[PDB]
Write a protein that holds these residues in place. Structure first.
Motif, PDB file in Angstrom:
ATOM      1  N   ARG A 266     -39.155  -9.684 -14.605  1.00 17.37           N
ATOM      2  CA  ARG A 266     -38.763 -10.008 -15.978  1.00 17.37           C
ATOM      3  C   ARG A 266     -37.275 -10.226 -16.161  1.00 17.37           C
ATOM      4  O   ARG A 266     -36.854 -10.740 -17.178  1.00 17.37           O
ATOM      5  N   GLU A 267     -36.482  -9.878 -15.173  1.00 14.41           N
ATOM      6  CA  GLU A 267     -35.049 -10.127 -15.284  1.00 14.41           C
ATOM      7  C   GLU A 267     -34.668 -11.492 -14.719  1.00 14.41           C
ATOM      8  O   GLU A 267     -33.966 -12.266 -15.378  1.00 14.41           O
ATOM      9  N   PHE A 268     -35.118 -11.810 -13.503  1.00 11.04           N
ATOM     10  CA  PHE A 268     -34.730 -13.056 -12.852  1.00 11.04           C
ATOM     11  C   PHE A 268     -35.916 -13.869 -12.343  1.00 11.04           C
ATOM     12  O   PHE A 268     -35.708 -14.848 -11.617  1.00 11.04           O
ATOM     13  N   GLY A 269     -37.144 -13.502 -12.698  1.00 19.41           N
ATOM     14  CA  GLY A 269     -38.294 -14.258 -12.238  1.00 19.41           C
ATOM     15  C   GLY A 269     -38.369 -15.632 -12.875  1.00 19.41           C
ATOM     16  O   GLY A 269     -37.916 -15.855 -13.996  1.00 19.41           O
ATOM     17  N   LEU A 270     -38.964 -16.570 -12.137  1.00 23.04           N
ATOM     18  CA  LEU A 270     -39.036 -17.951 -12.598  1.00 23.04           C
ATOM     19  C   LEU A 270     -40.008 -18.137 -13.755  1.00 23.04           C
ATOM     20  O   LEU A 270     -39.845 -19.080 -14.535  1.00 23.04           O
ATOM     21  N   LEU A 271     -41.008 -17.268 -13.889  1.00 25.58           N
ATOM     22  CA  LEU A 271     -41.946 -17.368 -14.997  1.00 25.58           C
ATOM     23  C   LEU A 271     -41.386 -16.819 -16.301  1.00 25.58           C
ATOM     24  O   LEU A 271     -42.052 -16.928 -17.335  1.00 25.58           O
ATOM     25  N   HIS A 272     -40.191 -16.229 -16.280  1.00 29.50           N
ATOM     26  CA  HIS A 272     -39.582 -15.686 -17.481  1.00 29.50           C
ATOM     27  C   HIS A 272     -38.194 -16.242 -17.759  1.00 29.50           C
ATOM     28  O   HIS A 272     -37.590 -15.869 -18.769  1.00 29.50           O
ATOM     29  N   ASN A 273     -37.673 -17.119 -16.903  1.00 27.60           N
ATOM     30  CA  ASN A 273     -36.349 -17.700 -17.080  1.00 27.60           C
ATOM     31  C   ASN A 273     -36.417 -19.190 -17.392  1.00 27.60           C
ATOM     32  O   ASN A 273     -35.518 -19.950 -17.028  1.00 27.60           O
ATOM     33  N   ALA A 274     -37.476 -19.619 -18.066  1.00 26.33           N
ATOM     34  CA  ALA A 274     -37.638 -21.006 -18.468  1.00 26.33           C
ATOM     35  C   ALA A 274     -37.272 -21.165 -19.936  1.00 26.33           C
ATOM     36  O   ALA A 274     -37.659 -20.348 -20.777  1.00 26.33           O
TER      37      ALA A 274
ATOM     38  N   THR B 113     -43.392  -4.023   8.778  1.00 25.33           N
ATOM     39  CA  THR B 113     -42.725  -3.662   7.531  1.00 25.33           C
ATOM     40  C   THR B 113     -41.896  -4.818   6.986  1.00 25.33           C
ATOM     41  O   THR B 113     -41.802  -4.998   5.766  1.00 25.33           O
ATOM     42  N   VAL B 114     -41.277  -5.605   7.869  1.00 20.68           N
ATOM     43  CA  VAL B 114     -40.484  -6.746   7.421  1.00 20.68           C
ATOM     44  C   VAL B 114     -41.368  -7.768   6.715  1.00 20.68           C
ATOM     45  O   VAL B 114     -40.985  -8.335   5.685  1.00 20.68           O
ATOM     46  N   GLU B 115     -42.565  -8.015   7.253  1.00 22.07           N
ATOM     47  CA  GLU B 115     -43.489  -8.938   6.604  1.00 22.07           C
ATOM     48  C   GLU B 115     -43.895  -8.435   5.227  1.00 22.07           C
ATOM     49  O   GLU B 115     -44.031  -9.225   4.286  1.00 22.07           O
ATOM     50  N   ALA B 116     -44.102  -7.125   5.090  1.00 18.55           N
ATOM     51  CA  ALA B 116     -44.438  -6.563   3.786  1.00 18.55           C
ATOM     52  C   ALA B 116     -43.297  -6.750   2.792  1.00 18.55           C
ATOM     53  O   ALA B 116     -43.535  -7.012   1.608  1.00 18.55           O
ATOM     54  N   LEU B 117     -42.052  -6.607   3.252  1.00 18.89           N
ATOM     55  CA  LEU B 117     -40.908  -6.827   2.370  1.00 18.89           C
ATOM     56  C   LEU B 117     -40.826  -8.278   1.916  1.00 18.89           C
ATOM     57  O   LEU B 117     -40.507  -8.553   0.754  1.00 18.89           O
ATOM     58  N   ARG B 118     -41.097  -9.222   2.821  1.00 16.61           N
ATOM     59  CA  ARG B 118     -41.061 -10.633   2.450  1.00 16.61           C
ATOM     60  C   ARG B 118     -42.109 -10.954   1.392  1.00 16.61           C
ATOM     61  O   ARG B 118     -41.860 -11.755   0.485  1.00 16.61           O
ATOM     62  N   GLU B 119     -43.293 -10.347   1.498  1.00 16.93           N
ATOM     63  CA  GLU B 119     -44.317 -10.549   0.479  1.00 16.93           C
ATOM     64  C   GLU B 119     -43.866 -10.007  -0.871  1.00 16.93           C
ATOM     65  O   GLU B 119     -44.191 -10.581  -1.917  1.00 16.93           O
ATOM     66  N   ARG B 120     -43.130  -8.894  -0.871  1.00 11.42           N
ATOM     67  CA  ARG B 120     -42.649  -8.333  -2.129  1.00 11.42           C
ATOM     68  C   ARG B 120     -41.547  -9.193  -2.736  1.00 11.42           C
ATOM     69  O   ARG B 120     -41.457  -9.319  -3.963  1.00 11.42           O
ATOM     70  N   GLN B 121     -40.688  -9.781  -1.898  1.00 12.95           N
ATOM     71  CA  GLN B 121     -39.665 -10.687  -2.409  1.00 12.95           C
ATOM     72  C   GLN B 121     -40.291 -11.903  -3.075  1.00 12.95           C
ATOM     73  O   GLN B 121     -39.834 -12.346  -4.135  1.00 12.95           O
ATOM     74  N   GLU B 122     -41.334 -12.462  -2.459  1.00  7.60           N
ATOM     75  CA  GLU B 122     -42.039 -13.591  -3.053  1.00  7.60           C
ATOM     76  C   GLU B 122     -42.639 -13.214  -4.400  1.00  7.60           C
ATOM     77  O   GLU B 122     -42.593 -14.000  -5.352  1.00  7.60           O
ATOM     78  N   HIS B 123     -43.208 -12.013  -4.497  1.00 13.98           N
ATOM     79  CA  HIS B 123     -43.800 -11.569  -5.754  1.00 13.98           C
ATOM     80  C   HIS B 123     -42.744 -11.383  -6.839  1.00 13.98           C
ATOM     81  O   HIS B 123     -42.986 -11.707  -8.007  1.00 13.98           O
ATOM     82  N   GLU B 124     -41.571 -10.858  -6.478  1.00 10.72           N
ATOM     83  CA  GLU B 124     -40.558 -10.566  -7.487  1.00 10.72           C
ATOM     84  C   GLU B 124     -39.885 -11.833  -7.997  1.00 10.72           C
ATOM     85  O   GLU B 124     -39.576 -11.939  -9.187  1.00 10.72           O
ATOM     86  N   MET B 125     -39.661 -12.812  -7.123  1.00 11.78           N
ATOM     87  CA  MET B 125     -38.994 -14.032  -7.555  1.00 11.78           C
ATOM     88  C   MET B 125     -39.829 -14.849  -8.529  1.00 11.78           C
ATOM     89  O   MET B 125     -39.306 -15.797  -9.121  1.00 11.78           O
TER      90      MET B 125
END
Length: 244
Positions: free
Chosen positions: A81-89, A65-77
């Motif tokens: 749309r609030e703090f993602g790098l593809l929308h904060n440029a 489950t911890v590995e699944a959470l890490r994959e979700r953190q990578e996806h969200e960063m």
């Protein structure tokens, strides 16, 4: 499971109270609040009692489950749309290629828009399209070393794959260039360690309880966020035509 390069290369800044303030000079400082990735780990009581001899399956499910959470953190960063790098440029930091394919001229323009570019991120299919342009012009870039690993590079800047970057149905993707570190006024990662029940730094597990069926439930929480200190620390190459 993938190589979460963004989590490995980003430095992490300690945050107190779950909030972070960044001064903006174009008004009011922007406030960053930590986001959470939560999941409920359900284990039947029979498994926790009897199946611990060859390997503790309670701990095995916890690591899964911890590995699944890490994959979700990578996806969200990347895609949030609030703090993602593809929308904060900044709009000045978004550029388009001269033509479809990502050419060596386009890469040189991307890294000339800021001082001390430190990493490039692209989809693995985009990296293959970049290599085809190199071969057509007869150039063989050398490569670099990062965190004990040998990776591909352009002008000494390591280029790292990331499958979380979306690919449009019309076969287009994006390339990300950024500066890192607080002392360099780059991009930083936000987290808070020292939380009461720390299974891992910034990650917590709580007993929660047991329901009518003999099923044990656990709550797993991780708190994270990302911030860009100055606008010229992040750049995007917008419409890269891969696939031809």
């Amino acid at each position: 499971i993938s190589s979460r390069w963004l989590l490995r290369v980003l430095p992490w800044t300690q945050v107190n109270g779950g909030t972070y303030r960044v001064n903006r000079r174009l008004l009011a400082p922007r406030e960053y609040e930590l986001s959470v990735a939560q999941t409920v780990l359900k284990i039947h009581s029979r498994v926790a009692d009897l199946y611990n001899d060859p390997m503790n399956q309670m701990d095995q499910q916890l690591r899964l489950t911890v590995e699944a959470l890490r994959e979700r953190q990578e996806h969200e960063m990347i895609n949030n749309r609030e703090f993602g790098l593809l929308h904060n440029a900044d709009l000045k930091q978004r550029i388009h290629t001269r033509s479809g394919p990502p050419t060596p001229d386009d890469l040189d323009e991307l890294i000339s828009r800021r001082r001390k570019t430190q990493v490039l991120l692209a989809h693995p299919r985009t990296i293959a399209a970049i290599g085809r342009e190199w071969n057509a012009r007869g150039i063989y870039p050398t490569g670099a070393e990062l965190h004990g690993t040998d990776v591909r590079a352009w002008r000494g800047i390591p280029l790292l794959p990331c499958n979380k970057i979306p690919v449009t149905p019309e076969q287009t993707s994006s390339i990300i260039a950024m500066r890192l570190g607080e002392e360099n006024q780059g991009v930083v990662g936000l987290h808070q360690t020292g939380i009461p029940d720390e299974y891992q730094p910034g990650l917590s597990v709580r007993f929660m309880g047991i329901n009518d069926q003999a099923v044990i439930q656990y709550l797993v929480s991780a708190y994270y966020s990302a911030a860009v200190l100055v606008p010229d620390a992040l750049g995007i190459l917008e419409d890269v035509e891969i696939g031809h």
